[PDB]
Design a protein around this ligand. Structure first.
Ligand code: HEM
Ligand SMILES: CC1(C)[C@H]2CC(=O)[C@]1(C)C[C@H]2O
Ligand SMILES: CC1(C)[C@@H]2CC[C@@]1(C)C(=O)C2
Ligand code: FES
Ligand SMILES: [Ca+2]
Lengths: 106, 405
């Protein structure tokens, strides 16, 4: 399946992401440097923050308590569609999913 | 040797395990630790050894505890407690929010973007070392490659001169493989003393090396102090040495005994990254932990404030509930789960550098020396602790089977 990562500056990168792989992992594996992924994907650092395009927000499983707690301390603007992309696990239902990457993580 | 059972620990949760001397060590260290995961052993046990402490034996618990720094603090992460007495490296002992400040700065030094551009030098360093060993038909991999590789990578990263390596080797060896000739605190102090004038010089004449970036950084909304800078620069060094030396040694010990696995990576080099993740799972080597901040019931067990709990990174990947046939090395393993770099906010900040070191070593070794074995009559001895390891690894090969590239 495909994920599209839109950088703060509007640059768009399209990745092939396998089932079961997190959107943070795919970003970090392929040089999407505006996703840091510092804690390695356990909703412990908030450096994999993204804005999920509203076309997909009713397709992605909802954020759990932990993710909601961790999201409180993102350094870019917290938005209704803010997610930690380490918590978004690719599946065929999400093919085409677009996420926007904020201008900061740390 | 064996501490008294505290009044809150029930005798049925008691288990015999010394993490510095596990019984079946000769089978290999990971094997010796897997006794904690035998059929009827509880997910959470107490050992009388090493001052007395808890051990979470299963990946599910280990991960959970690492994700809860409010109950499980890093303020005292080492067993025995006295082992971290003079230990003050940053940010090992911090919880968020402060620990995050330091991690942000460290990420500028060893983050993915930095490793990616560092790769050509890493390859050159690995290739040089390997090509210098190749004609000999023998080495002690631990001293001849495993040790010099990561410390040279550090000198490069930190803009330091090669002539300084013997001194730094000596100090970090004293901290990690003490001689009796010097205490840990003396060796630590001497490392910081080497660092701190370089720190201060580069705060005023900045460069693009790691020490300059750390020296000029901000934490907590103000400049990093020289003291904080030296204490983190110290760990960027120490953090990258023993773990890498020992992990590469376990891997190469394995490959030396597994001609089919070698042949797999020779015939299909593109499998080396996947193979490397499976070796990190199988040969996981770290075991530290946390301290209870308050009385807390966890998975049905009453833990008390001040209890130490070992949360061994090593065990998660060996846990048969997480990986079927955990002792089997399968480079095609579908869902490789481990916590070899740790878990939670403290997960190894050097993980990307480590992986590149592993991947480059395996590709650059196998390309030149595809065929190798343990020296005949060599007794390969593991050691167990917070970072478990291999004492020595005598390898041998026929130079007729090697190739310079
Ligand atoms: C196979 C190689 C390595 C392994 C298995 C490994 C494993 C680990 C683990 C398990 C932790 C967490 C311990 C805890 O939670 O208390 C850690 C932390 C750390 N590692 Fe690594 N590491 C490796 C390589 C490296 C390298 C190459 C570097 C730097 C050049 C490095 C630097 C650090 C630092 C500074 C920390 C402290 C992070 C913090 O406390 O937030 N490590 N490592
Ligand atoms: C437990 C550790 C892995 C961590 C703190 C230590 O001293 C280590 C042994 C090296 C460092 O990275
Ligand atoms: C064993 C260690 C890796 C860790 C850092 C220094 C060390 C020697 C300790 O006693 C704690
Ligand atoms: S990678 Fe740390 S919260 Fe997502
Ligand atoms: Ca001094």
């Amino acid at each position: 399946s495909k994920v599209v990562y839109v950088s703060h500056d509007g640059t768009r990168r399209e990745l092939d992401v396998a089932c079961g792989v997190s959107l943070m992992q795919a970003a970090v594996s392929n040089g999407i440097y505006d996703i840091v992924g510092d804690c390695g994907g356990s909703a412990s650092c908030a450096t994999c923050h993204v804005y999920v395009n509203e076309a997909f927000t009713d397709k992605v499983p909802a954020a759990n308590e932990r993710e909601i707690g961790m999201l409180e301390s993102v350094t870019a603007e917290l938005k209704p569609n803010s997610r930690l992309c380490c918590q978004i696990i690719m599946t065929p239902e999400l093919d085409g999913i677009v996420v926007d990457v904020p201008d900061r993580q740390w | 040797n064996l501490a008294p059972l505290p009044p809150h620990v029930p005798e049925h949760l008691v288990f015999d395990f010394d993490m510095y001397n596990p019984s079946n060590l000769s089978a290999g260290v990971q094997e010796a630790w897997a006794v904690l995961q035998e059929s009827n052993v509880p997910d959470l046990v107490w050992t009388r050894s090493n001052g007395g402490h808890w051990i979470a034996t299963r990946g599910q618990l280990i991960r959970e505890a690492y994700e809860d720094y409010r109950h499980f603090s890093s303020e005292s992460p080492f067993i025995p407690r006295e082992a971290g007495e003079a230990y003050d490296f940053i940010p090992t002992s911090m919880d968020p929010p402060e620990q995050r400040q330091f991690r942000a700065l460290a990420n500028q030094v060893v983050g993915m973007p930095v490793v990616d551009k560092l790769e050509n030098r890493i390859q050159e360093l690995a290739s040089s070392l390997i090509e210098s060993l190749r004609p000999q038909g023998q080495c002690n991999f631990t001293e001849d490659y495993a040790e010099p590789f990561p410390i040279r990578i550090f000198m490069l990263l930190a803009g330091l001169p090669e002539e300084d390596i013997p001194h730094l080797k000596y100090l970090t060896d004293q901290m990690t493989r003490p001689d009796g000739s010097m205490t840990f605190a003396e060796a630590k102090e001497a490392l910081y003393d080497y660092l701190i004038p370089i720190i201060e010089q580069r705060r005023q004449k900045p460069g693009t090396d790691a020490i300059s970036i750390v020296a000029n950084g901000q934490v907590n909304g103000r400049p990093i102090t020289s003291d904080e800078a030296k204490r983190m620069c110290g760990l960027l060094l120490v953090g990258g040495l023993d773990t890498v030396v020992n992990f590469l040694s376990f891997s190469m010990e394995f490959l030396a005994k597994s001609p089919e696995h070698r042949q797999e990576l020779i015939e299909r080099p593109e499998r080396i990254p996947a193979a490397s993740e499976e070796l990190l799972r199988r040969f996981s080597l770290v075991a530290d932990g946390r301290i209870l901040t308050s009385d807390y019931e966890f998975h049905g067990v009453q833990l008390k404030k001040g209890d130490q709990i070992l949360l061994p990174q090593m065990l998660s990947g060996l846990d048969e509930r997480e990986n079927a046939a955990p002792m089997h090395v399968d480079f095609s393993r579908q869902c490789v789960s481990h916590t070899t770099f740790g878990h939670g906010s403290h997960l190894c900040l050097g993980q990307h550098l480590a992986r590149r070191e592993i991947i480059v070593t395996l590709k650059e070794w196998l390309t030149r020396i595809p065929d190798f074995s343990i020296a005949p009559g060599a007794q390969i001895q593991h050691k167990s602790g917070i970072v478990s390891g291999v004492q020595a690894l005598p390898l041998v090969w026929d130079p007729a089977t090697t190739k310079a590239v």
